[PDB]
Design a binder for this molecule. Structure first.
Ligand SMILES: Nc1ncnc2c1ncn2[C@@H]1O[C@H](CSCC[C@H](N)C(=O)O)[C@@H](O)[C@H]1O
Length: 223
């Protein structure tokens, strides 16, 4: 059996510090949001290993560095009073991070973080994770976990200032772009399941015109 090396932290704080020291985390705010959201409540096993871990339904909770990259990409869009959509909420981790990131920038009664997941088992599982973490997040009514097909976003709370997609979109996610507010940003892996995909960024400007930028090569493979 081929053996390999992989980073690990002694605890949540030590895991984030390690990432910041090595340049993975650029901003202090991103580091703080992740520091206050302990992976132990969201990852059943190896919580502090910088690697993807299974959570059920044939899916995994992203590796810590991938969560960091996503937070950095949307650091200027995560502000008090905004509406954020997290398509494919899974474990609920990234969702809790968004809530804390903004909560630090100050509170606003209109802030709304919506996580949409289509697997019922994960919807119940994630809610339980969030209540084990901090029962007040769900109780605030500012964080939401809904059951549905994320490909059609969630119109009740549209338009969104920022949208993050954790699952692959076979092509241009038209309906999601339609739910973006002017000046909003959307992060999503584009391409058929099984190949060289691209994590892509879509920015809509004040005139409603859309611009696409490729951020990095990515590949969905068996763990
Ligand atoms: N059409 C769709 N609508 C909603 N969720 C979807 C979906 N297609 C895939 N998913 C969900 O995409 C998620 C990808 S894994 C997401 C992991 C989560 N960000 C974490 O850190 O744990 C899974 O939970 C999967 O069930």
């Amino acid at each position: 059996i081929h053996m390999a090396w992989r980073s690990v932290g002694a605890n949540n704080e030590d895991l984030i510090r390690q990432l910041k020291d090595h340049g993975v985390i650029a901003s202090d705010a991103v580091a703080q949001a992740m520091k206050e959201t302990d992976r132990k409540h969201y990852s059943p096993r190896n919580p502090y290993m910088d690697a993807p871990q299974p959570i059920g339904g044939g899916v995994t909770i992203s590796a810590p560095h991938m969560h960091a990259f996503a937070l950095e990409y949307l650091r200027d869009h995560l502000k008090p009073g905004a509406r954020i959509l997290d398509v494919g909420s899974g474990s609920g981790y990234l969702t809790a991070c968004f809530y804390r990131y903004i909560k630090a920038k100050g509170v606003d009664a209109d802030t709304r973080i919506v996580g949409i997941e289509h697997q019922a088992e994960l919807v119940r599982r994630s809610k339980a994770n969030l209540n084990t973490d901090d029962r007040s997040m769900l109780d605030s009514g500012q964080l939401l976990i809904v059951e549905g097909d994320g490909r059609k976003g969630y119109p009740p709370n549209a338009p969104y200032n920022a949208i993050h997609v954790g699952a692959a979109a076979p092509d241009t996610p038209t309906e999601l772009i339609n739910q973006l507010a002017s000046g909003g940003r959307l992060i999503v892996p584009v391409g058929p399941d099984g190949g060289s995909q691209y994590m892509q960024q879509y920015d809509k400007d004040a005139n409603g015109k859309v611009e696409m930028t490729r951020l990095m090569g990515v590949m969905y493979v068996p763990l």
